[model samples]
Target: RTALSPGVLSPTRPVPNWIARPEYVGKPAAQEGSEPWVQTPEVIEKMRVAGRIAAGALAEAGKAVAPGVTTDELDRIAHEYLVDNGAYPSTLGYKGFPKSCNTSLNEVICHGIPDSTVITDGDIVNIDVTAYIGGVHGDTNATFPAGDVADEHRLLVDRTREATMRAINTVKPGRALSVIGRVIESYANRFGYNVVRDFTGHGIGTTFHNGLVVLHYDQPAVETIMQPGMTFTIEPMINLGALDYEIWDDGWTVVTKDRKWTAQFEHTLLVTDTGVEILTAL
Candidate 1:
């Protein structure tokens, strides 16, 4: 097969010597923790701290995304930032994943492993950042235009961000989880875009993933009620073409089957008594 995309520039990166790693580095382990399901005031505070650190790492990486920069370099920037802030890059070695963060570009839906792929003008990429600190986890992501992107691509990115916020705004103590997907799908459908169904937002706090399953499309079967002390993520992947996707031989990168562009935005959030708090907001 001819190259489906430009492809990567390097292999998976190794953790720097200066950073302290989690226990799962050399061996497989279950997800980080199980305490995020129902957070207490102290746990919520720790999540807030970790979320800020992860957001900083993401912001540092976003600043490094340019026409000539490679995705691996962006990953390095994030990794250093996390270590400097005394947080471990949570994604590094999680389930044997090799990179510190994720950089999904163009047709890639999510989990695009950072490699030698060089970004260029008019390209849009999503940077997913997660960190572990104080025995908790924080996660967030955003898709950015490399320099100046096409109007259509920009619309897709902006609409994806809008959909995320709209769905997040609907979160409350008594609301059903399906309301999230319903609102997101409604917004995406209005613009003739499709939501990637294979991946969904998830609960995050003491662990990278927890009990809450946040769907980005209208699925009537998800009726879990929202409540205070709950924390989760609301990242939505919106595509410009068919929603179908295929994984690469590496078993990580996911790309749109139709080869159309895709964009995604994510934020870890905490459910309050009356509304939601965007824990990962920069």
Candidate 2:
């Protein structure tokens, strides 16, 4: 198979002017806010709506993945779905990101831009979808098998999803945030796979990426406790080889250092009184 390379990207598709966009769009970054990561009364309901919309958009986009399909087309599918549903593709104009969503294929760790790269046999592609509506955001992603994939690649994708779910199951009011990473890291280790720590899950609400730093590897210093009304993502990038990675010149795409394949799964979760709710689950 040919090595993955940056593909030609189509022009950014337009969303209807009526769709609400994040206030920070086209800005260098999400406005650095010092507020807590907890959701407000009305915002809590809005978060649920946002999560459902994002999940629907992702499901629609994932259906189109196939051999010879372009990542740009996948982005379009998601982009159109988001707009038609009255939500903004939050990733567009987000921190200068060019596409509506990320389509990371094979070794690309995350933030893979949608472009001309055609889906090929035995490939695993990660499509990240986030939508903003009612002043809140929902983010989630899952790796999909393109055509006939090898067992090794399938295992990597399956384990990553399991690792994310296992960690999510540990969430509750009294539990420490450290358990998230501990669970993920422990599961990855059992399979001889390493966790990618460079990009940790984040707090999402009115702000796209908030101050809440949820790590995916065990870190004893993390003392934050899970609390109700708190919403965030737990997307882990699991690698089949070395943990080292390099960003493409585009400054968004991240590929493993040895070019070995990596798989990722993400979900926006709400910490609840008993356990948790997968806000982005389909």
Candidate 3:
């Protein structure tokens, strides 16, 4: 079942400074076809159920965020919360991911596994969460203030969330995947921010990830149209300075190349006949 999407050279090529490995990498996801993945209405409905589970887990985890708590504590809380609610922590063993939630702090771009890192003022962090329930998956994430973050850090978190919202708004049947990039890039540039092209938003449902891997930056290569039953993610990673990021020796923690702080927001969405539905939205 190991496969590569058609026409992709090396789907897992890490962005400069990223620590992507060969085994975890897969082919570029499928894109732009009216051809469906053979999902039923019941299946699509399950995706919504999974989304709610994920969204609730994130909300519960957020309430525990504070300057005194350690990132590992957050992970433990989120993990137990998900399991208690009868949903599995999708990231626990997924692709070798060790933590229940990705705790990307300060300059870390994404995939920062939970550790002894204690939260403190002036630091901003991104809590990335995904939940699996009822044979479906829901993926979404948000960057939040760590204690009393600086005003600049607050702006970074706000803009990153807003950028994701814009991408969601622009997604509809017949819209090109490129449009998502266009909106994302425009908002980033307008605020003089940088967009990380490394990790991408993805398609999720019966399978964790499938067709049409969505890139956050502007790309002429991707021109797939949005259509019904198509589920994908639009997560925009915005940097305070340059878009360049780096990877730690652990082969999983990805941080800013220049050590500049990065923030991100994600949403799993389903394309409808007229528009799209936000799986993570309440």
Candidate 4:
């Protein structure tokens, strides 16, 4: 991947007034309530639809990953898909954020902006998308290689995906939330990879970012027990180098301090009575 440089951005895409926007769009974010994370039967269906919409749009945007495709190119594809389905791009206009879905390039840990930065061959790009529809939000992401990437980078991508999945499997009611961090951290240890803790998974639902903070490494101090009504995300950013990072001058794009690559996988989850359902499952 080329050195980290800011890219050109087009005008922000507009959303229709009929589409409901998140509470945090234009002003200060609202405080999240302590209500049960579980949705009502009617709201559950709405969340399922929202999740599927996000997954489909994410997949559609991911197909644009290839040599010569700019990050903004992916944003255009995702912006149209979300609006066409009666959903709003959750990131667009989010606290002044200026993009649709986020297109994070190699080494960018999270929140990379969409722009005219060209994706070259041998680069790994992580596409993160969240859609707001029916009064809720669904968020998910995956990493893809632009073309022929180094085998190690591909392994980093695969391992990061598995770590998120493994953490998800620990979400049944009565389990400690710390189990997720333990699982992800231990798994990364086995692969000689490190988990990035600078950005933790967050609770996402009616508000774009709810109050829950999900750590990707073990922390026994986190004593919150998993409950059926709770919903949140478990995105793990795993790195091939040290976990230290540097945010770009743009204030969003984050890269590894060591300059080695990192990859991430994210999923919105609904805790169930028995097990967890990946709300953003494709």
Top of the candidates by TM-score: 2
Q: For residues 30-103, what per-residue lDDT tens digits would candidate 2 score against the true structure?
A: 78456578787688788889999999999999999999999999999999999989999999998888899999
Residue-level lDDT tens digits of model 1 in 1-282:
122353654555555565556567677765554544768889899999889999999999999889989889999899889888888889887888878899999999999888878888889989999988887889999998998899999999999999999999999999898999999999999999999887999988767887677899999897689999899999999999998889988788998887899999999999998989999977
- Which model scores highest in lDDT? 2
Instruction: Please report how far candidate 3 places residue 12 from its true position, in Å.
Output: 27
User: Each candidate: what lDDT?
Assistant: 0.87, 0.91, 0.75, 0.87
User: What's each prediction's TM-score?
Assistant: 0.93, 0.98, 0.85, 0.95
Candidate 4, 144-203: lDDT as tens digits: 988999999999999899999989988899999899999999999999999887789887
Query: Could you tell me which residue pairs clash in candidate 3?
Result: 29-212, 30-211, 30-212, 245-257
Q: Give the TM-score of candidate 2.
A: 0.98
Residue-wise C-alpha lDDT for candidate 3, range 1-282, written one tens digit per residue: 111111101111112223222222233332223435435678789888878878887877878888877777777777777776667666665665667788777888888878877777667767878877776678888887867788888988898889999989998888887889889989989888988887888877766666657989889788588888888888888888777766676678877667778899888998888998998874
Query: What ranking of all candidate models by TM-score puts the best one first?
Result: 2, 4, 1, 3
Better of 2 and 4 by TM-score: 2
Where does the lowest 10-residue lDDT sum fall in candidate 2?
Answer: 32-41
In terms of lDDT, model 2 sits at 0.91
The lowest-lDDT stretch of 10 consecutive residues in candidate 4 is 28-37
Clashes of each: 3, 0, 4, 2
Q: Candidate 4, overall lDDT?
A: 0.87
